[PDB]
């Protein structure tokens, strides 16, 4: 009779039950306890300012209308039946387009206990918005948020809470990090209030703190640019009479800087301001530009004022390495210390 | 108290007809609109559209849904919207749109004792607006959103903005990577067709493009290459290898700049303001190398005349290039 017992309990719960009304409607506030497990913190797109995350979403609340007495204390609902009861209308405030997985079947589970408690779990992939400040690129760090709450019920009707301490209510898997250009440092868990044109709502928030890796840009952009500037100052040590040698030297280092500059801008997103990399390239471009102007001055004074032409070349061998060396000290202390 | 609500709600939906509008056969039903803009992104020049996410609310009064005895606003499960009458609102310039559905459909229905119905939706839409890019990147754009009723006329339904100019919120919190919103505007009007009038609401934004990216990536590199081409005029004319190499390498550098800019900028196949400046700089470096051809050809027979051409080139070229910039920037700023 165990099979008949289980069937009877299923066919009795939804008798006289209206799913258009939340539990405790007109009597009390519905409390929903939530916790999140993150299985993979997916790719971050700097172009679109968005990121992907895969989570198990768990919610828990009490519904007195679904109490029962029987040999067992927990019931699992078929997804056809799980669509007959009231569930919270949780949505992500900064979500762009999310996916609920149903392969090979809907990845939902709803458990009912005898006292009336409901446990509701689902598997989701969320694409959310992470606005970024790129003034310090590529030495920038960002906090990408994740906010969710009720779409229709105000805080006088539905409130959200974390199942445990807020720190321990969001758990990331050991192999969760799936980032190629960022380093996930940690997360902070909070809870706030938002006011709209329709009322006041409870918002649950999580922030993921990311720091960009800079080793790639040092070997790809900064080192080639520094070597090209050093090469342009090598021209000062060639003899003045080698006019074709020094003209070819200077004008080809300008084309080399132009090639490097165009390559670097492809990685950067289309931002209005100037990043930390934009300023470094512009200064390097002005340095190689000034080295060719210097030879034009030296060549002009040769054969008429050889003393002045020699004096200009000797001072350039000191001023140019000094000014560029000074610029790097200021540059790498202004941005590495933020 | 919950049993009394259960009885009252089931009373309203008993005998309710979805196929008949409120005040059917009488005065038109008035619908008030609110828009809460959440984010604007992906302003595409090639596709000539933009993507918008917003909260869209509609307010109207239906006497068949009036209830008494409960001093509350009844927020019902969003699946009850299929059991009621809702306006046939649509967006006239919408290319692609959808309603978010995680974890459930982002929809709201709220009832009030007097019969007022609040109906909310969270919508992401791609709307088409024409962009005139002849002055790119020094251009301003005006993109709109048009709201109209598909089937009814002004004898059945009417549209108005709920709250006046405050009906649309959230524009002041928008940040665009390449643009800056200057103003937004709300227009309400009727369209007089042959079959009668039709209500329409319109929301427009004016965008002003940012210039900082183009100054350091497009204009300044081209200006410096032009100046370097004038170094040839201060070199002695018998240094043929130095001046030819300097002249022809600046032509290659200018070509490299123009080709790669075409690769990175959006593909807009007609003449813009940016194409005129790059082409103008290319002509200047073309003429600087052409100047040495004349000097090299006559510096042996007429060495004094060849020296006078180089001295005048030191003045005419910098003066004519600033004259080109003055006319260009006045006509575009």
């Amino acid at each position, epitope marked *: 009779d165990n099979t008949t017992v289980f069937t009877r309990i299923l066919d009795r719960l939804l008798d006289g039950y209206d799913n258009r009304l939340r539990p405790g409607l007109g009597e009390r506030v519905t409390e929903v306890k939530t916790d999140i497990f993150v299985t993979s913190f997916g790719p971050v797109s700097d172009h679109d300012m968005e990121y992907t995350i895969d989570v198990f979403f768990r919610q828990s609340w009490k519904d007195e209308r679904l109490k029962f007495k029987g040999p067992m204390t927990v019931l699992r609902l078929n997804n056809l039946m799980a669509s007959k009861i009231w569930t919270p209308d949780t949505f992500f405030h900064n979500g762009k387009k999310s996916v609920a997985h149903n392969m090979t079947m809907p990845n939902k589970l709803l458990r009912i206990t005898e006292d009336g408690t409901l446990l509701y779990t689902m598997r989701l992939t969320v694409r959310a918005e992470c606005p970024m400040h790129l003034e310090d690129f590529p030495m920038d760090a960002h906090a990408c*948020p994740l906010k969710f709450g009720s779409y229709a019920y105000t805080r006088a009707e539905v409130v959200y809470e974390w199942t445990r301490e807020p720190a321990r209510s969001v758990v990331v898997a050991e192999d969760g990090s799936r980032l190629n250009q960022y380093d996930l440092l940690g997360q*902070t868990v909070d809870s706030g*209030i938002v006011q709209s044109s329709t009322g006041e709502y409870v918002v649950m928030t999580t922030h993921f703190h990311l720091k960009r890796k800079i080793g790639y840009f040092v070997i790809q952009t900064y080192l080639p640019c520094i070597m090209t500037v050093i090469l342009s100052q090598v021209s000062f040590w060639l003899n003045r009479e080698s006019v074709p040698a020094r003209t070819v030297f200077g004008v080809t280092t300008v084309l080399t800087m132009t090639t490097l500059s165009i390559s670097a801008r492809n990685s950067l997103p289309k931002v209005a301001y100037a990043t930390a990399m934009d300023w470094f390239i512009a200064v390097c471009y002005a340095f190689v530009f000034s080295a060719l102007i210097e030879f034009a001055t030296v060549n002009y004074f040769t054969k008429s004022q050889p003393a002045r032409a020699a004096k200009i070349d000797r001072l350039s061998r000191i001023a140019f390495p000094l000014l560029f060396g000074i610029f790097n000290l200021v540059y790498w202390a202004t941005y590495l210390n933020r | 108290n919950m049993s009394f609500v259960k009885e009252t709600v089931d009373k309203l939906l008993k005998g309710y007809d979805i196929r008949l509008r409120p005040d059917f056969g009488g005065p038109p039903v008035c619908v008030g609109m609110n828009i809460d803009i959440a984010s604007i992104d992906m302003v595409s020049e090639v596709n000539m559209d933009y993507t918008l996410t917003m909260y869209f609310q509609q307010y109207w009064r239906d006497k068949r849904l009036a209830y008494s005895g409960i001093p509350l606003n009844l927020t019902l499960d969003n699946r009850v919207a299929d059991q009621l009458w809702v306006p046939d609102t649509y967006f006239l310039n919408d290319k692609k749109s959808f309603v978010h559905g995680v974890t459930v459909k982002n929809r709201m229905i709220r009832l009030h004792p007097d019969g007022t119905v609040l109906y909310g939706l969270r919508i992401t839409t791609t709307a088409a607006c024409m962009m005139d890019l002849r002055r790119y990147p020094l251009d301003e754009q005006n993109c709109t959103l048009e709201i109209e009723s598909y089937g009814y006329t002004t004898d059945d339904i009417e549209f108005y903005w709920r709250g006046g100019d405050k009906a649309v919120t959230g524009v002041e919190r928008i940040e665009l990577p390449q643009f800056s919103i200057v103003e937004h505007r709300l227009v309400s009007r009727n369209v007089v067709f042959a079959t009668g009038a039709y209500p329409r609401l319109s929301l427009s934004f004016r965008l002003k493009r940012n210039i900082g990216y183009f100054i350091l990536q497009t204009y300044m590199p081209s200006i410096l290459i032009t100046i370097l081409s004038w170094v040839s005029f201060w070199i002695n004319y018998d240094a043929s290898a130095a001046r030819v190499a300097l002249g022809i390498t600046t032509v290659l550098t200018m070509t490299t700049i123009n080709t790669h800019l075409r690769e990175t900028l959006p593909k807009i196949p007609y003449v813009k303001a940016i194409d005129m400046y790059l082409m103008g700089c290319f002509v200047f470096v073309f003429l600087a190398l052409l100047e040495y051809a004349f000097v090299n050809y006559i510096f042996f027979s007429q060495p004094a005349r060849a020296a006078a051409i180089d001295r005048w080139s030191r003045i005419v070229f910098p003066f004519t290039f600033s004259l080109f910039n003055l006319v260009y920037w006045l006509y575009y700023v």
Partner: nanobody
Amino acid sequence: QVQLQESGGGLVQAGGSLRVSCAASGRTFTTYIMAWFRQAPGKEREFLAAMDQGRIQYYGDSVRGRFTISRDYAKNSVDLQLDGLRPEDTAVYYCAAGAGFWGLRTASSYHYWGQGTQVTVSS
């Protein structure tokens, strides 16, 4: 340059409204987090409230339900409505702006700070 100038303050008779403002200049903080802090004499600097770009409001566990924060995004400012003031609320109220890296409730994550404004409560 960027300066956070603060107004309001003064003295109140152990109650009443007291709206402390904060005006920013030299940079638009629409995409930043604007917060308020409090430092009692010699004790510690304490977090009070914060509002992000999405208008989400965060409050400290001691001032929840008494102090209300708001932002006027057009004028690039932030306000804090102080109601039901008590003698323990006598301190220097600070205005801060930041990106909230590693936590919006920690003072060490805000780039810009105000010059302060003494608020005195007399009982």
